[PDB]
Design a protein around this ligand. Structure first.
Ligand SMILES: C#Cc1c(F)ccc2cc(O)cc(-c3ncc4c(N5C[C@H]6CC[C@@H](C5)N6)nc(OC[C@@]56CCCN5C[C@H](F)C6)nc4c3F)c12
Ligand SMILES: Nc1nc2c(ncn2[C@@H]2O[C@H](COP(=O)(O)OP(=O)(O)O)[C@@H](O)[C@H]2O)c(=O)[nH]1
Ligand SMILES: [Mg+2]
Length: 169
C-alpha cells in the first residue's frame, strides 16, 4: 500500500476538522473541539491504487519552533483552507503558503486551495478573486461544503493526484 502524508492548514473556524471528519467518517460533525490537533487515517482506492491517507488536522497555539517545523516538514501535500464568508481567512492564505515553502525549502510543494462553506449565501470572497490567487500560485482551486459534502472527496483526491505527479518528475 502506498502512504500519503496530507496536512490541512488555515485559520481557526474555517472547517478544517469538519472537512477531515467528512472524509474519514462520512458525516458532518458540527462543533468539533476547536483546539484538538490530531492525525486521522483512511484507506481508499484512488485511480486503481490502494492508498493510505494520513491526514494531519492542525489546530492550537501559534508557535514557530524547530520541533513544529520538522513536524510540518513531514507533510507531502497541503490543503490550504479558507472560508468563503471570512475575508481574513482568505488573506491569511499567503502566510500559510509561505510557512510551507519555508519548512520544505522549495517553491514546488503539492498544494490545493480550498474555499469551504459554499452552502452559505453570505459570501465575501469572490470566486474570481480566489481562482486568480490559485492561478498565480499554479495550484488547483476547489470550493467545498463539509456540511453537504459537496467537493470534499474531490479536494482530497486532487491533492493525492498532485503528490503523485510531483513524485513522477
Ligand atoms: C499552519 C501552519 C504551518 C504550516 F502550514 C507550515 C509550517 C509551519 C511551521 C510552524 O513552525 C508553524 C506552523 C503553524 N502553526 C500554527 C499556526 C497558527 N495557530 C493559530 C490558530 C490558527 C490556526 C491554529 C494554529 N490556531 N496560527 C497561525 O497564523 C496565525 C496568524 C493570525 C495571528 C498572527 N498570524 C500570522 C497570520 F497573520 C495569521 N500560523 C501558524 C503556523 F504557521 C506551520
Ligand atoms: N455552513 C457550514 N458550516 C461549517 C462548514 N464546515 C465547518 N462548519 C462550521 O464551522 C465551525 C468551525 O468548523 P471547524 O471544523 O471546527 O473548523 P476548524 O477550526 O478549521 O477545524 C463549526 O461550527 C462548523 O460546524 C461548512 O462547510 N458549512
Ligand atoms: Mg479543528
Amino acid at each position: 500500500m502506498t502512504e500519503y502524508k496530507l496536512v490541512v492548514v488555515g485559520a481557526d473556524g474555517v472547517g478544517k476538522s469538519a472537512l477531515t471528519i467528512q472524509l474519514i467518517q462520512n458525516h458532518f460533525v458540527d462543533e468539533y473541539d476547536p483546539t484538538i490537533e490530531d492525525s486521522y487515517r483512511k484507506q481508499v482506492v484512488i485511480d486503481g491504487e490502494t492508498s493510505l491517507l494520513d491526514i494531519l488536522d492542525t489546530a492550537g497555539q501559534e508557535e514557530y519552533s524547530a520541533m513544529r517545523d520538522q513536524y510540518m516538514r513531514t507533510g507531502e501535500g497541503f490543503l490550504l483552507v479558507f472560508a468563503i464568508n471570512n475575508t481574513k481567512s482568505f488573506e491569511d492564505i499567503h502566510h500559510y503558503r509561505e510557512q510551507i515553502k519555508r519548512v520544505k525549502d522549495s517553491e514546488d510543494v503539492p498544494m490545493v486551495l480550498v474555499g469551504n462553506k459554499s452552502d452559505l449565501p453570505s459570501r465575501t470572497v469572490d470566486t474570481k478573486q480566489a481562482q486568480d490567487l490559485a492561478r498565480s500560485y499554479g495550484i488547483p482551486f476547489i470550493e467545498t461544503s463539509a456540511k453537504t459534502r459537496q467537493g470534499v472527496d474531490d479536494a482530497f483526491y486532487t491533492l493525492v493526484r498532485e503528490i503523485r505527479k510531483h513524485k513522477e518528475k
